[PDB]
């Protein structure tokens, strides 16, 4: 099922059926929001914020506990990224490979992997341009 690979793995998270907060959870919703804002101010991405809250603060899911996603909570408080987080990591990975190809020009494998990464950027960038999340003039590098 992987695109650009032959793997067929199915590893994933299984969101629990019940959509209400756990009974044992006894923290105010407002307190969770302030924790989210603080971490975003420090520079943590929405994916990383959920890990810290879930691991150490008992926040099973931000939407379930607070009623709004982490992305919407941050945007309500003025915190929003330049570009979608998944696109942000794809570009960084492309930069790192391009840096490596600069020093090592004989690494034909890295050249092959760069094509796959840039292809993923184009497909992902095109989607965001269609939805207007990304300005229409935006182009990769």
């Amino acid at each position: 099922g992987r695109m650009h690979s032959a793997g067929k793995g199915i590893s994933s998270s299984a969101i629990p059926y019940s959509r209400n907060a756990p009974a044992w959870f006894k923290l105010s919703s407002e307190s969770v929001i302030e924790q989210i804002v603080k971490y975003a101010r420090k520079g943590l991405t929405p994916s990383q914020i959920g890990v810290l809250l879930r691991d150490a603060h008992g926040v099973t899911q931000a939407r379930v506990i607070t009623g709004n996603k982490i992305m919407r909570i941050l945007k309500s408080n003025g915190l929003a990224p330049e570009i979608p987080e998944d696109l942000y990591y794809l570009i960084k990975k492309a930069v790192s490979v391009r840096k490596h190809l600069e020093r090592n020009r004989k690494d034909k494998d890295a050249k092959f992997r760069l094509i796959l990464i840039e292809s993923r950027i184009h497909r992902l960038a095109r989607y965001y341009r269609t939805v207007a999340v990304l300005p229409p003039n935006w182009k990769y590098e």
């Binding site: 971490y39 975003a40 420090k42 520079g43 943590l44 003025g78 915190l79 990224p81 330049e82 942000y88």
Partner: peptide, 22 residues
């Protein structure tokens, strides 16, 4: 948290980089 922090991810961050750039 310090190692997982990104210097350039949020709109306020790049503006800060722009302020220092000029």
């Amino acid at each position: 948290i310090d190692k997982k922090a990104k210097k350039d991810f949020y709109r306020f961050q790049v503006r800060e980089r722009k302020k220092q750039e000029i």
